[PDB]
Structures are given as C-alpha cells and as structure tokens.
Structure 1
Amino acid sequence: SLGLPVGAIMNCADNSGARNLYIIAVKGSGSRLNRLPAASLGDMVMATVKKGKPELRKKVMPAIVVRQAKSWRRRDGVFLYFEDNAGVIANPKGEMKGSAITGPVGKECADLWPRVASNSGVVV
C-alpha cells in the first residue's frame, strides 16, 4: 500500500521545526496512465517547504517519509498504521539537516536509511 498521493501537505518530523511540506514530486514513482505518484513510508521524495523556517520556504528538498498513517500490509500479517503522516528532510544522500528528530520512526524507514536511524531515538 502506497502512502500519501502527490501534493499531500505532510507535517515535518525533524527537530529544526517546520509547519508542513508539499510533495511536488516523487522519486522512483510508478509512472502509469491515470496512476499518480504516491510516496510510501521510507521513500525519498522531493517535497517543497510549504511553510516553515523563512529560509527553507519556497525551495524543494529531498524529504524522507517517517510515518504513513495508512493501513499497509507489512510482511508481518499485522495491519499497523500511525497517527499522522510525517517526514524528515535530508539531502539526496540522507544527510538530515537537523541534529535530532521528533516523534517515533518505523523500522521500514530506519533500515533503508542508516543515517535516519542514527538520527532517531524512539525507533518502532
């Protein structure tokens, strides 16, 4: 199950603090006729900073999703989900701008991004 669709106003998950972000674009999206991109948990996406720090506004940066909030069938039969959609922001190599994170992070995103896992304390 893919996560939020294109343009979803997801909340920030880093310690720097940002009001929200707009997912203008997705990476590795399933480009298909009538099927819009849908960024899932752990996928690196290019999302603009709709609101937040004055310098961060009006520029697109790679956003790493840390929460999905939707029901997805992990290889474990439990259909777990989260409170709300959230994602940290980092460079294309996963170098998170902030020095800490806000809220918990899932194992699926932590495994794919060692830097994010090191940058999070409440894992799973």
Structure 2
Amino acid sequence: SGNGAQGTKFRISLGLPVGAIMNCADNSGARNLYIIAVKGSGSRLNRLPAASLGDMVMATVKKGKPELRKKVMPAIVVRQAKSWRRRDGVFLYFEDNAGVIANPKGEMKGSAITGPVGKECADLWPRVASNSGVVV
C-alpha cells in the first residue's frame, strides 16, 4: 500500500512471504515477480514480511525480458491463492499467485492485465482498475 493508494484496506490473510514468486500478469515482458519486500509491513523478530491482495511489494523479475531482469522494482499483488475472508462472510481464493509491475505512485508499467483481478486490489489502485477485465 502507501503512495497513490487512495482508499484504506481491510486486513486480508497474508499469502506471500518474501521469497515467494508470483506470475507476472501484465504485458510488460516480465514472466514472474520474486517478492523481496512488502511495503508498510511491520517488525517482529523472525517474521517474514508477507504480502496479500492489493499490497505493493518490491520485486525483481526472475524470468523475462533482460531489460527488466537484474533489478528491483515495485509491483502490486492482484491474485492470491491463500484463501482469505471478506466482510460478507466469504472465504475465496484464486488459482494462482500474481501481481503486476508498477511505479511508486502506482502506475502500471504495462497496459493489459491478463486473467482476473480481486476487487480489493481494483478498489485500491485505479490504474489497475483501468486495465482489468473480469474483477473478482
């Protein structure tokens, strides 16, 4: 979360600790995203920081265009897999872990998002809304 995130976010189950790799779901040239940090996460001895739906992470691209590899950039988690629970009572989950590469302000690097996108992320990051097909 943080910059450019207009909205607050209700807690959702943390799915992705540091080291996790999600699918890159944009058209940027990136094939996956390797999580090295979660923004706005706190501190407890021994705890991995771990992201969830609509969290902004800091990632590198393990697989993808060489102009994207070997460096750290912001991304946003768009699909989960660890099931979480909404305030309408529902426990839901996607089939994959996936997020999209983005700028500190929260602008997509790419122009499409392939696959669905959870609403809690859509609601959080307007330029993500824009590029989303099926939401939730």
| Aligned counterparts of 1:31 and 1:49: Cα–Cα separation in 2 | 26
Deviation, 1:17, is 3.6
| Aligned counterparts of 1:17 and 1:106: Cα–Cα separation in 2 | 22
Question: Does structure 1 conserve the Cα–Cα contact (< 8 Å) formed by 2:26 and 2:113?
Answer: yes
Deviation, 1:35, is 1.5
Deviation, 1:32, is 1.0
Could you tell me the TM-score, scaled by structure 1's length?
0.94
| DSSP-derived class of the 2:78 partner | strand
| Identity rate, percent | 100
| DSSP-derived class of the 2:61 partner | strand
Deviation, 1:30, is 2.6
CA root-mean-square deviation: 1.1
Deviation, 1:18, is 2.2
| Aligned counterparts of 1:2 and 1:30: Cα–Cα separation in 2 | 13
Deviates further, 111-120 or 14-23: 14-23
Could you tell me the TM-score, scaled by structure 2's length?
0.87
- Summarize deviations over 1:74-123 as a string: whole Å, max 9, x none: 11211000001000011011110111111011110001101100111221
Deviation, 1:2, is 0.8
Return the match for 2:76 from 64, 67, 82: 64
- Summarize deviations over 1:34-67 as a string: whole Å, max 9, x none: 2210111100111111111110001111010000
| DSSP-derived class of the 2:84 partner | coil
How many positions carry a matched residue from both structures? 124
Deviates further, 80-89 or 18-27: 18-27
Unaligned runs of 5+ in 2: 1-12
